[PDB]
C148 mGFP-cDNA-1
Amino acid sequence: KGEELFTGVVPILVELDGDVNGHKFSVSGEGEGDATYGKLTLKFILTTGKLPVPWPTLVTTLVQCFSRYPDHMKQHDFFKSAMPEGYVQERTIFFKDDGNYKTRAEVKFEGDTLVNRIELKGIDFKEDGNILGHKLEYNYNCHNVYIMADKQKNGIKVNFKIRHNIEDGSVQLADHYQQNTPIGDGPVLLPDNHYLSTQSALSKDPNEKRDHMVLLEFVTAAGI
């Protein structure tokens, strides 16, 4: 029945507790998701510390329950089926020839609000590398995310490689290893293999003085 929680517009709260090479920071995100259109609109603000990594590196970490699953694919929507109790999302993100993020999040309803509570630890970042040196372009490429069931672990596994464009025409690769597991004991949908097509647009609020990121996404499930 978790699918039914997502028929209209759902308010979203994101809270990120970050520590990258000892540099501590917090980010708060507010907006809303409309899974009917696979649409996310969020504004993220740095609320503690100085931002020691580029905004684009945090996009994947900062709620796939807002994906649009076409009607013929509804039986493959693990993310909504885990709600409202929610799921744990864990990743390791390897930045090629640089450091790594380890993330743990709980995605669940808290009253009527979909909440993404994240802990992020970054280590091994190079001082004059693409991340700590803020050399990534403020943009995002369209990416496909390949979803597989891991039935023996009662969840899903997701591998994918983000390409972050750099001005000089090189790219910073970010290799993602993701697992999602239900929080609840209730039955969830374990999907057939499929992907999510994710389009992301990054912008700025011209009225906002704090370090921030405005994000618009469209996410569509395909490939069954």
